[PDB]
Amino acid sequence: AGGTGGRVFNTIRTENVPLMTVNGSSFSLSSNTHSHNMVFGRGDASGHNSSPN
Amino acid sequence: YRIGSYYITEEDINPGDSISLGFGSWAKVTGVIMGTGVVNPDGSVPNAQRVEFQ
Numbered sequence: 001a002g003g004t005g006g007r008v009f010n011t012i013r014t015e016n017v018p019l020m021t022v023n024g025s026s027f028s029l030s031s032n033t034h035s036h037n038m039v040f041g042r043g044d045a046s047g048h049n050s051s052p053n
Numbered sequence: 054y055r056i057g058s059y060y061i062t063e064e065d066i067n068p069g070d071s072i073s074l075g076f077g078s079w080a081k082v083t084g085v086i087m088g089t090g091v092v093n094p095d096g097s098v099p100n101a102q103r104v105e106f107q
Contacts, residue, residue, distance in 0.1 A: 002094045004087035
């Protein structure tokens with residue numbers, strides 16, 4: 001035996017790596033109708049697939 | 054080092070009546086090891102010498 005005791009390589013010790021999870025959260029964003037800017041007027045020529053404004 | 058359960062001095066008539074009797078603390082450890090070294094056996098640095106306080 002030895003005067004100093006330790007359990008590293010092989011011994012019945014305690015303590016481990018905890019595992020936990022976070023509760024489900026949903027991100028909510030508001031689509032503001034302003035701040036979209038504007039260029040030109042009625043077509044004319046308009047970019048294809050552009051968002052209607 | 055001498056160990057005895059009788060509370061009589063070594064120089065007393067009841068005791069052997071020779072030599073000086075002094076109180077001894079702790080148990081005598083054989084010169085070579087000092088005890089606790091390494092968890093897994095590797096061994097620490099022991100202490101030696103007589104009367105030396107370390």
